[PDB]
């Protein structure tokens, strides 16, 4: 729906999983009145990545929610190659960088507001039988100080109609320190593994992205920084089987860490739902104010 002749490159916002996002200005009138948008593109346009990317586009187009980044259109250019996804531009960047920059300004009640918005977005995804699979503060964008959005769906898969999990193995590195144990061992992804990842995201938020306190740093410290290669994965698996967990962040109340640890249940069926998580976070937020 967008003509590439009118997409004016402004800068690069980030490089992702085989793809990159650029801040551009759509200005078809050539009068500097067009709107600034985000453009996602592939870096190596293989056919597998092209099919994955169009399924991602279809997924994002099917989503309308206050906490999901808005789809705007696509841009074909030549033939059907060089496909580009057009989305709304959110001016405050990733929740990771934003929280790091304003840590002296963001108290726990604001963190819980962000947490509730994330829970509601993830529940909306679940109603569509979508498994995000990549939930992390780097993937959460900030529209303003009062609104965050889930902002990337490059790893999102649709559940089969007859099964409540999706088994996917991927040639390439994976954010294993956000993954549920069943995802590490059997490549099984579900709403419950998304709940595990959400627990990791809550941990992130309450560490205020202190880099020493990052999940990879803490996990490598727990398993020993001497480990390398596939052994790392192996040790992580073992550490999760022995109920080794990320520590309570500094200043985090015990109820928030309890939410985290309940999300970190080894038994997939004993993990809370996103609606229960939203209810508990909203009740704690109401009690604090
Ligand atoms: C759709 C969208 C709408 N608005 C914005 N706003 C925005 C606005 C600003 C800065 C910015 O300033 N970035 C610099 C350089 C990179 N950071 C590491 C530090 C600061 C900025 F990154 C984003 N992003 C969007 N997407 C997006 C852009 C970059 C990245 Cl890294 C990501 N992360 S990700 O994991 O989900 C993906 C790369 C796999 C897609 C998402």
UniProtKB/Swiss-Prot annotation:
Function text: Non-receptor tyrosine kinase involved in various processes such as cell growth, development, differentiation or histone modifications. Mediates essential signaling events in both innate and adaptive immunity. In the cytoplasm, plays a pivotal role in signal transduction via its association with type I receptors such as growth hormone (GHR), prolactin (PRLR), leptin (LEPR), erythropoietin (EPOR), thrombopoietin receptor (MPL/TPOR); or type II receptors including IFN-alpha, IFN-beta, IFN-gamma and multiple interleukins.
Organism: Homo sapiens
Start and end residues of each Protein kinase domain: 7-282
Tissues in which the UniProt entry reports expression: Ubiquitously expressed throughout most tissues.
Domain of life: Eukaryota
Residues bearing PTM Phosphotyrosine: 26, 124, 130, 165-166
Taxonomic classification: Eukaryota, Metazoa, Chordata, Craniata, Vertebrata
Any coiled-coil regions, as ranges: none
PTM annotation: Autophosphorylated, leading to regulate its activity. Autophosphorylation on Tyr-26, Tyr-124 and Tyr-130 in response to growth hormone (GH) are required for maximal kinase activity. Also phosphorylated by TEC. Phosphorylated on tyrosine residues in response to interferon gamma signaling. Phosphorylated on tyrosine residues in response to a signaling cascade that is activated by increased cellular retinol.
Subcellular location: Endomembrane system; Cytoplasm; Nucleus
Residues at which ATP binds: 13-21, 40
Domains: entry comment: Possesses 2 protein kinase domains. The second one probably contains the catalytic domain, while the presence of slight differences suggest a different role for protein kinase 1.
Active site: 134
Assembly: Interacts with EPOR, LYN, SIRPA, SH2B1 and TEC. Interacts with IL23R. Interacts with SKB1. Interacts with STAM2. Interacts with IFNGR2 (via intracellular domain). Interacts with LEPR (Isoform B). Interacts with HSP90AB1; promotes functional activation in a heat shock-dependent manner. Interacts with STRA6. Interacts with RHEX; this interaction occurs in a erythropoietin (EPO)-dependent manner. Interacts with ASB2; the interaction targets JAK2 for Notch-induced proteasomal degradation. Interacts with MPL/TPOR.
Protein name: Tyrosine-protein kinase JAK2
Disease in which the protein is involved: Chromosomal aberrations involving JAK2 are found in both chronic and acute forms of eosinophilic, lymphoblastic and myeloid leukemia. Translocation t(8;9)(p22;p24) with PCM1 links the protein kinase domain of JAK2 to the major portion of PCM1. Translocation t(9;12)(p24;p13) with ETV6. Budd-Chiari syndrome: A syndrome caused by obstruction of hepatic venous outflow involving either the hepatic veins or the terminal segment of the inferior vena cava. Obstructions are generally caused by thrombosis and lead to hepatic congestion and ischemic necrosis. Clinical manifestations observed in the majority of patients include hepatomegaly, right upper quadrant pain and abdominal ascites.
Family to which this protein belongs: Belongs to the protein kinase superfamily. Tyr protein kinase family. JAK subfamily.
């Amino acid at each position: 729906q967008f003509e590439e002749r009118h997409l004016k490159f402004l800068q690069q916002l980030g490089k992702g999983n085989f793809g990159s996002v650029e801040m551009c200005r759509y200005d078809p009138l050539q009068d500097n009145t067009g709107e600034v948008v985000a453009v996602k593109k592939l870096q190596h346009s293989t056919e597998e990545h092209l099919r994955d990317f169009e399924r991602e586009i279809e997924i994002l187009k099917s989503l309308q929610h206050d906490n999901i980044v808005k789809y705007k259109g696509v841009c074909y250019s030549a033939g059907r190659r060089n496909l580009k996804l057009i989305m709304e531009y959110l001016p405050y960047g990733s929740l990771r960088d934003y929280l790091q920059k304003h840590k002296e300004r963001i108290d726990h009640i604001k963190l819980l507001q962000y947490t509730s918005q994330i829970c509601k977005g993830m529940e909306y995804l679940g109603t569509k039988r979508y498994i995000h699979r990549d939930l992390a503060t780097r993937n959460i964008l900030v529209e303003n100080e009062n609104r965050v959005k889930i902002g990337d769906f490059g790893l999102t898969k649709v559940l089969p109609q007859d099964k409540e999990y999706y088994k996917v193995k991927e040639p390439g590195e994976s954010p294993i320190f956000w993954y549920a144990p069943e995802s590490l061992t059997e490549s099984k992804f579900s709403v419950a593994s998304d709940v595990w990842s959400f627990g990791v995201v809550l941990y992130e938020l309450f560490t205020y992205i202190e880099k020493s306190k990052s999940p990879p740093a803490e996990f490598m410290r727990m398993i020993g920084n001497d480990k390398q290669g596939q052994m790392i994965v192996f040790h992580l698996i073992e550490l999760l089987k022995n109920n080794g967990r990320l520590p309570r962040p500094d200043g985090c109340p015990d109820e928030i860490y309890m939410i985290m640890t309940e999300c970190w249940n080894n038994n997939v069926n004993q993990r809370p739902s996103f609606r229960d998580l939203a209810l508990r976070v909203d009740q704690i937020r109401d009690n604090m104010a």
